[PDB]
């Protein structure tokens, strides 16, 4: 079965936000205007029996103090009364602030997305579901103490961290998104288990700075971590095809070397050629271009690893409906062998007039540096094999 997170409650908590106002509204009813909805098994989101459940459960990979000045900053913003300055340096301590502000619902939303991918995390553990998405998730910068890039709470470290402990296991973690996703490096760093790549774009001045050069070499894991993290940074401009080439053979060998228990993927939007960032040219086609997205989600899957499919960036809403859309049917067809077909066409729902003015399901665009990170972790892959005593051809 292909589990999907959803509910009434958390479609109201995952459109509370202002950064990313009702993206999440605008993916479910694209998925279900399609009728695939039927397709998938609902996954509630997970929800406790007390302050003190909720609080163990955060608190595995953030501090009390932290989760203590977000649930103060829910609190604060539900007043018509400006911060005092004490409060606004705790903010500060925090980073609560900037790129990361408190609005009324801070504290619900973040943990909607935390509440979606620990029950996503439980669903494959329990084997009910082969797959699980949670396109409500994905957030992959936020740290231990610290708000970052649009991330409250960590809800992929939680989601490894509960299927790593699930056996009285080792996880691949693949991150898609345009962004490098250091919160969930820097979390597994010193643990072999968990094995982190990401590829995205690096360049000076560009967001989070990480997943790059440091002579200069890449730090790559420390202590038994020591070359669990892996990093592939792109140059801008890079279309469909060179970034499948590009990560193919690094997906296929990570496999074979980790063998890995479950699979975590990222699927941040922000890489497509329509996203405001207009970075990176990745588009959503499906031919019967390839979507580099479709590409190393259909590889990912034919792996036959039970895996949990998350979103992320994507600030092109309508785009990124469009394109997790896509990812959902294909998840359907890789895993239940029953064919979806997807018309070309938008069908009519309450969202019909932000797909306008053409109405149609692919995104309205037209189309050796590489070889060196291929050899340099393909030397990585071994080193990480040589020191987990792993055996490999
Ligand atoms: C304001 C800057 S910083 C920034 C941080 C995170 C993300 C993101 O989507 N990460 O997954 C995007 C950003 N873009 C900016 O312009
Ligand atoms: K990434
Ligand atoms: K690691
Ligand atoms: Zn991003």
Not at 117 to 141: F, M, P, Q, T
Not at 344 to 360: V, W
Request: charged share 20%.
């Amino acid at each position: 079965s292909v589990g999907i997170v959803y509910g009434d409650q958390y479609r109201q908590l995952c459109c509370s936000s202002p950064k990313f106002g009702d993206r999440y509204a605008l993916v479910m009813d694209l998925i279900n205007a399609y009728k695939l909805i039927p397709e998938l098994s609902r996954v509630p989101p997970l929800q406790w029996d007390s302050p003190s459940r909720m609080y163990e459960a955060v608190t595995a990979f953030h501090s009390t103090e932290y989760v203590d000045a977000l649930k103060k900053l829910q609190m604060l913003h539900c007043e018509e009364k400006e911060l005092t300055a004490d409060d606004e340096l705790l903010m500060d301590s925090f980073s609560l602030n900037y790129d990361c502000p408190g609005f009324p619902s801070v504290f619900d939303y973040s943990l909607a997305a935390v509440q979606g991918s620990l029950a996503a995390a439980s669903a494959l553990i329990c084997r009910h579901c082969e797959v699980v998405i949670n396109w409500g998730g994905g957030w992959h910068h936020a740290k231990r103490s610290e708000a970052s890039g649009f991330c409250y709470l960590n809800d992929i470290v939680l989601a490894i961290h509960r299927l790593v402990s699930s056996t009285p296991t080792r996880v691949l973690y693949v991150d898609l998104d345009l962004h490098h996703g250091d919160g969930v490096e820097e979390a597994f760093w010193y643990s072999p288990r968990v094995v982190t790549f990401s590829v995205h774009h690096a360049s000076p001045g560009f967001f989070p700075g990480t997943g790059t050069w440091n002579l200069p070499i890449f730090l790559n894991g420390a202590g038994r971590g020591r070359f669990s993290a892996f990093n592939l940074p792109l140059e801008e401009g890079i279309n469909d095809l060179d970034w499948s080439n590009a990560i193919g053979p690094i997906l296929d060998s990570l496999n074979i070397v980790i063998q890995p228990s479950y699979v975590v993927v990222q699927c941040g939007a922000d890489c497509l050629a329509t996203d405001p960032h207009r970075i990176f040219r990745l588009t959503n086609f499906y031919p019967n271009s390839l979507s580099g997205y479709l590409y190393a989600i259909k590889k990912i899957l034919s792996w036959k690893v039970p895996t949990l499919i998350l979103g992320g960036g994507g600030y092109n809403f309508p785009d990124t409906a469009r394109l997790w859309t896509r990812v959902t049917a294909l998840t359907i067809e890789e895993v239940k062998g029953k064919k979806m077909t997807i018309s070309p066409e938008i069908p009519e729902h309450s969202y019909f007039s932000r797909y306008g003015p053409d109405f149609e399901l692919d995104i309205d665009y037209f189309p050796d540096s590489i070889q060196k990170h291929h050899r340099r972790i393909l030397e990585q892959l071994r080193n990480y094999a040589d020191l987990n005593k792993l055996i490999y051809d």
